[PDB]
Amino acid sequence: AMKIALINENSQASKNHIIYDSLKEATDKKGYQLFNYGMRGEEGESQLTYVQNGLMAAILLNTKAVDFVVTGCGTGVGAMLALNSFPGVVCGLAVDPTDAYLYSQINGGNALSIPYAKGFGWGAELTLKLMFERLFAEEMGGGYPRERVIPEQRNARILNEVKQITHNDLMTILKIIDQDFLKDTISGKYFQEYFFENCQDDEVAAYLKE
């Protein structure tokens, strides 16, 4: 059963309830498990910037705690930039339902960022619900058009092969990265609850536990 994470940062935390409700409708339909890992817009909660969003997503995805991360920010760009800087994280950006569908078919990565402020007005939750339906409608990497499945899959494969070279490994990153930065990223009660229960990488769990 595919595991999905939702991660909101500071600027858009007050919209988390809406984004979650929209996402949950789509994940429920597919039978996926949804984990609300980031900010919920609750007073006094543990804070996250879009850069910390990338770090959290990298920890979750590389350890297989989740299979897919949904994130974003005001424009979605910042979160997208940060997630893609990490090993094992391929994060698209989508602004309409067709974009979300094409992302799933052409790129078939393990994360997507969406704008939650720019263009986000009346009826925004209708668009979100539709975007999430289209994101999960069909098996990922299936190609658009169906006839271009081979080269699209090939290039997606090569990107991953290149990322193996261009990124440092996760354990190195965690040991080098600023320690307050990392502690703050993983300090949230929900991360603390969900991650250790779902982490499939014993080495990383042990390092983060203290």
Add this chain to the structure above:
Amino acid sequence: AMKIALINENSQASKNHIIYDSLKEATDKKGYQLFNYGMRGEEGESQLTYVQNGLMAAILLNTKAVDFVVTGCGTGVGAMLALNSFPGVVCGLAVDPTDAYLYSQINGGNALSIPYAKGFGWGAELTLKLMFERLFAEEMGGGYPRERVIPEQRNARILNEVKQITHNDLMTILKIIDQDFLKDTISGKYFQEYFFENCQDDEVAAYLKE
């Protein structure tokens, strides 16, 4: 005088002339130098995939051959994913003129990817011209709104600091990466002409020269 690179891959090479003409109008206005580094849609020319786009952009940006890279593909997502996997490359994705403006103010990275197929129909060159005007209208990183300049700049700074850790360095990447892959990326006559003339990193120039 800011140096801009345009890099098109295979799928969108036939649109290069249009994209270049639109870009050149905006760069001319600002007094920037524009270099058409990728595919031009000319028969028998040296080929590039969106992944090779990332490699080329990383070489150009890290050596200071150019200061800014404009790229894209059918949706712009693939190129965005690849460019962001490299050290020293921060590539946004923008679909309308306001997106391009916000990118420049909020993120202030050194690359932008645009869709050249999805949504690209009648009057697409009007939209492109406007997007490029808005991209270069104001000093980058100036903040939107002006009042949020401090935290937006701070997060942009932190992303770069994190990228120092999460990415391998360029020289390592070039020595490790598949050699046919790298040779094919840099085999184009225009790269061969422009890069060595503009490269400010003696070490990289020497490695690529053979």
